[PDB]
Amino acid sequence: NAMDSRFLPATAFIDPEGRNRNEVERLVQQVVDLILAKLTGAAERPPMPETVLPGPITIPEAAATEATLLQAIRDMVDGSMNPANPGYIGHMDPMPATMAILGDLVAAAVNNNMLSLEMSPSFSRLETLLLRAIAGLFGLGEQAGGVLTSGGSLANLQALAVARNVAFDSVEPGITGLAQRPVIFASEAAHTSLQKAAMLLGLGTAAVIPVRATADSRMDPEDLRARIDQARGAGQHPFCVVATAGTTTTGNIDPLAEIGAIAREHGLWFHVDAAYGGALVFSERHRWRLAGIEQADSITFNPQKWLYVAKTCAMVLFRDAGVLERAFRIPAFINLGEIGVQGTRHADVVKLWLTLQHIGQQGYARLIDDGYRLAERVVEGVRQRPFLRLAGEIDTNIVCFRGEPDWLPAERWDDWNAALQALLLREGKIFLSLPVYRGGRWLRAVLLNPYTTDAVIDAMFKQIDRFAGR
Amino acid sequence: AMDSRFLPATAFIDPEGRNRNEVERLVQQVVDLILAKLTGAAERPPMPETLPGPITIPEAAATEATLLQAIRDMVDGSMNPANPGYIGHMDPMPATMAILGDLVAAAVNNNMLSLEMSPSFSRLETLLLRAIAGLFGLGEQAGGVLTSGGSLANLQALAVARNVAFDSVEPGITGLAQRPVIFASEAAHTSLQKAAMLLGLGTAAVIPVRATADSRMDPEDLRARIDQARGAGQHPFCVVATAGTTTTGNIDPLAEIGAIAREHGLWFHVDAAYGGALVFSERHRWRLAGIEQADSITFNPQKWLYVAKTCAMVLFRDAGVLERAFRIPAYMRDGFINLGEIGVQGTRHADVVKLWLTLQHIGQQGYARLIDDGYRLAERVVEGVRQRPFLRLAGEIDTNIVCFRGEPDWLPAERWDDWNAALQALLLREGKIFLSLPVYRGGRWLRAVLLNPYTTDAVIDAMFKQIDRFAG
Numbered sequence: 001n002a003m004d005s006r007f008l009p010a011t012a013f014i015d016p017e018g019r020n021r022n023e024v025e026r027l028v029q030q031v032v033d034l035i036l037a038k039l040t041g042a043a044e045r046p047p048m049p050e051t052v053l054p055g056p057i058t059i060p061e062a063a064a065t066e067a068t069l070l071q072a073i074r075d076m077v078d079g080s081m082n083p084a085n086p087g088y089i090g091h092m093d094p095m096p097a098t099m100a101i102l103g104d105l106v107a108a109a110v111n112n113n114m115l116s117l118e119m120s121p122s123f124s125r126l127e128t129l130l131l132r133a134i135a136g137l138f139g140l141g142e143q144a145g146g147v148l149t150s151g152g153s154l155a156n157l158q159a160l161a162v163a164r165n166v167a168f169d170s171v172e173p174g175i176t177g178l179a180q181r182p183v184i185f186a187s188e189a190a191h192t193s194l195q196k197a198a199m200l201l202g203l204g205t206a207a208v209i210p211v212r213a214t215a216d217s218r219m220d221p222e223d224l225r226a227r228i229d230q231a232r233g234a235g236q237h238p239f240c241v242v243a244t245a246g247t248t249t250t251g252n253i254d255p256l257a258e259i260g261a262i263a264r265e266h267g268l269w270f271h272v273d274a275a276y277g278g279a280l281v282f283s284e285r286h287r288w289r290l291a292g293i294e295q296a297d298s299i300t301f302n303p304q305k306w307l308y309v310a311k312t313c314a315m316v317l318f319r320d321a322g323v324l325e326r327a328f329r330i331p332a333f334i335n336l337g338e339i340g341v342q343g344t345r346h347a348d349v350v351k352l353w354l355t356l357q358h359i360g361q362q363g364y365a366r367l368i369d370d371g372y373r374l375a376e377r378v379v380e381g382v383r384q385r386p387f388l389r390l391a392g393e394i395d396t397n398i399v400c401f402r403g404e405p406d407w408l409p410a411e412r413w414d415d416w417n418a419a420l421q422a423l424l425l426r427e428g429k430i431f432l433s434l435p436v437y438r439g440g441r442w443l444r445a446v447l448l449n450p451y452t453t454d455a456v457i458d459a460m461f462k463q464i465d466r467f468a469g470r
Numbered sequence: 471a472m473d474s475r476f477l478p479a480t481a482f483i484d485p486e487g488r489n490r491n492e493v494e495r496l497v498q499q500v501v502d503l504i505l506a507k508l509t510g511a512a513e514r515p516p517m518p519e520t521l522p523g524p525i526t527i528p529e530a531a532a533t534e535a536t537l538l539q540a541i542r543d544m545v546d547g548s549m550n551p552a553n554p555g556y557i558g559h560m561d562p563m564p565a566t567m568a569i570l571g572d573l574v575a576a577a578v579n580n581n582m583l584s585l586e587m588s589p590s591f592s593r594l595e596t597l598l599l600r601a602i603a604g605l606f607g608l609g610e611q612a613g614g615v616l617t618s619g620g621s622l623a624n625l626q627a628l629a630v631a632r633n634v635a636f637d638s639v640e641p642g643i644t645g646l647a648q649r650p651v652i653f654a655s656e657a658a659h660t661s662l663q664k665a666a667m668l669l670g671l672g673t674a675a676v677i678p679v680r681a682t683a684d685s686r687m688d689p690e691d692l693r694a695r696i697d698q699a700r701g702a703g704q705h706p707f708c709v710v711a712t713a714g715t716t717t718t719g720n721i722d723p724l725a726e727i728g729a730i731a732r733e734h735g736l737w738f739h740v741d742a743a744y745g746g747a748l749v750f751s752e753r754h755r756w757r758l759a760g761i762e763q764a765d766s767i768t769f770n771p772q773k774w775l776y777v778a779k780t781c782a783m784v785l786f787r788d789a790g791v792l793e794r795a796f797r798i799p800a801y802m803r804d805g806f807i808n809l810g811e812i813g814v815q816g817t818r819h820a821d822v823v824k825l826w827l828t829l830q831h832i833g834q835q836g837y838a839r840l841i842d843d844g845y846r847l848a849e850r851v852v853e854g855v856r857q858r859p860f861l862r863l864a865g866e867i868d869t870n871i872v873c874f875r876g877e878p879d880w881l882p883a884e885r886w887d888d889w890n891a892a893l894q895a896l897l898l899r900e901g902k903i904f905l906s907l908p909v910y911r912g913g914r915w916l917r918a919v920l921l922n923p924y925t926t927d928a929v930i931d932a933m934f935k936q937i938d939r940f941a942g
């Protein structure tokens with residue numbers, strides 16, 4: 001009735017008996033052609049878009065023309081960041097695997113819902129089985145399981161929610177009746193989704209007690225021990241320790257076995273935030289760096305980062321999946337909505353499973369090796385240059401470094417590194433990020449793009465030398 | 471390393487064109503496969519024909535043929551809301567542009583975490599949500615963020631309400647000596663209880679207000695409960711009204727409930743996850759009267775605006791509240807606020823692309839027409855029920871949702887639940903018609919959600935003929 005009417009475009013929906021197949025096929029092909037053109041041509045667009053500024057938006061009364069829509073897609077693509085450019089080396093945001101793109105097409109077309117088994121009969125079972133398999137690569141044991149979540153922040157929130165619920169039995173009565181303030185410990189280098197989660201969970205941001213990190217940005221276990229004693233002495237109630245496997249700024253890995261041993265000694269939930277570094281489970285050569293992770297009560301891991309799955313794709317894993325029934329699920333197989341922060345949720349398992357199959361464990365082991373190799377080339381270039389300083393030793397394919405030119409007052413180093421970052425981008429078409437770290441602005445390389453080469457790295461250093469020598 | 475033996479030729483799209491031909495062919499095969507399933511969706515039943523073994527992640531790359539067969543299997547094993555007989559849930563066939571929008575989003579793979587990771591999309595999302603906040607009538611300060619589902623939008627609205635009432639961003643709420651509570655209809659969404667658990671309030675902090683026979687919140691009982699809460703030494707801080715209850719699709723009286731919230735100094739949140747779409751219908755939008763005074767609104771285009779999941783938002787009448795009462799005191803190099811700092815999520819998929827493309831292609835007039843046709847089908851179901859003395863309506867309808875059940879006099883009330891389950895199974899197996907069967911009022915009820923643009927009077931007629939045959 002609506003679709004026959006003059007108030008809907010003939011291609012607004014796909015007629016399920018094929019009546020508008022030809023019109024629908026031509027519209028789809030125009031969008032597919034445009035996208036393939038932009039992506040097979042991605043190196044023609046710089047890593048960051050040229051500056052334009054947009055006016056107030058209006059939602060039209062009448063249907064837009066296919067022309068207007070295609071032009072909108074064109075402008076949206078041209079105005080977006082372009083991590084497919086070999087020069088894009090700044091963030092844990094990679095070009096997507098081909099199958100990941102196609103898996104989201106497939107997911108959106110069937111439009112199933114992870115909320116319940118009846119709404120995702122194929123997908124729910126697959127996600128549950130795949131995450132058991134992944135939990136097994138982490139060595140979490142037979143009872144281990146998890147859920148997919150829209151982002152690592154939600155995975156951290158859910159881990160901390162469970163750790164809180166187990167410590168305080170807070171599912172039904174909440175935590176406002178408490179005389180001792182609950183607190184958690186994390187490296188001073190750990191992700192701010194811990195503070196955001198602590199605020200959301202009613203613990204407040206201050207409940208995340210920072211633990212000293214070494215010169216190489218790894219948590220100091222002796223300091224963790226100190227801070228736990230201090231918390232107890234102050235009448236606080238520690239309930240969780242978060243170790244990070246791949247810190248956001250520097251990509252370093254905490255000493256997971258030692259941290260875990262301290263958490264267990266003190267009866268604290270041990271959560272490992274392996275959002276980035278968890279991908280090392282696919283590399284024989286580098287997997288040892290995660291040693292201790294197998295004793296975690298929970299793990300956060302984001303395939304959208306180092307496994308090249310188009311955003312979002314992240315999970316939280318529990319060593320005992322049964323805990324979600326005990327200390328999460330509200331009073332009322334298992335409909336996944338009941339045991340996640342989200343209810344309705346897009347079927348990320350489609351792009352995850354298709355991606356994992358097409359690249360394979362050996363494929364990831366090779367991508368990971370090549371990331372390390374580029375990273376080590378950056379480290380060597382920094383070592384050859386007295387005016388550059390490394391943040392510290394690297395644990396992953398991330399290198400944080402900055403200029404500390406001795407001919408400049410330190411008060412002007414932030415300006416110097418900001419200027420270098422802008423120049424690398426403008427003239428070298430190379431994007432580094434510029435995080436705040438240790439109270440200063442540092443440059444940050446994340447060597448993820450499979451098409452970044454040694455030549456790009458040598459090119460960056462050449463322009464750095466030219467900038468340094470004015 | 472693409473040059474290596476260890477990765478398929480098409481694992482990634484070479485940014486200088488080197489595998490363009492191979493990538494095009496692979497992409498074309500999946501596109502053609504998906505179009506056949508969707509242009510052929512009426513041949514697949516609304517639900518798949520009826521356990522898988524443990525999964526193994528393969529060492530070596532899978533063949534393109536294995537991958538294609540996986541897609542075929544996954545689709546054939548999926549629910550199929552595109553079937554005209556799928557009429558059971560708030561889960562629609564996706565608009566064509568929403569499918570294509572997600573294709574575009576995944577291809578450029580930007581991140582809504584921050585402006586520099588989503589330079590065009592972050593500004594577009596902020597401006598579009600101001601525009602939508604304006605349609606809801608929230609005023610010039612109104613703004614919002616997209617979220618992955620309405621549960622997160624409800625979570626975020628209730629976090630902000632709690633933070634404003636208790637100054638809890640930094641110290642938390644463990645210090646409190648009177649328990650914070652919220653009020654909501656006994657018909658309201660369970661994401662309130664889940665949100666309450668997450669926020670540290672406990673599931674019991676959601677105090678249920680009596681609803682009428684038509685499943686609408688009773689403003690008099692809300693007042694009683696607020697009085698009772700304060701007498702019991704609780705601290706009310708928020709009232710949630712629901713515009714479109716999940717089971718029956720009813721709309722709370724937003725103006726009266728909001729008057730009562732404002733009278734008692736409580737945050738007024740409207741969960742318009744479903745019914746919010748009425749903002750695009752001149753003819754039905756009056757049903758939301760009072761919503762314009764809300765402190766916050768949850769709205770889910772993935773429901774009645776046909777945007778492929780997920781797509782939802784939380785809107786605030788004063789978007790500055792997010793800076794004041796949400797954002798943490800404080801990885802990247804205008805003054806614009808990175809959206810990750812003012813949402814529950816940090817990294818987020820660019821849902822704005824399918825939303826904006828869909829809104830433009832359907833337009834306000836298209837939605838008004840879609841909504842009308844939904845009310846027409848629902849009214850046809852209501853009429854069918856009225857004619858059959860063995861069927862009972864749950865109550866008056868407010869949206870395109872109809873909850874009803876068999877209560878046949880010739881069977882004892884104790885057997886009604888099994889009668890209705892068996893009818894639901896029958897409609898599905900014989901009729902190829904899917905109705906959901908929620909628990910409501912301690913009973914099993916049938917539930918029709920009349921969303922598919924291709925559901926016709928004839929589908930409804932067939933459902934009633936199967937019901938008649940079953941009852942005879």
Ligand SMILES: [K+]
Pocket residue numbers: 382383384385386387388389390
């Ligand atoms: K150096």
Ligand SMILES: [K+]
Pocket residue numbers: 855856857858859860861862863
């Ligand atoms: K009747």
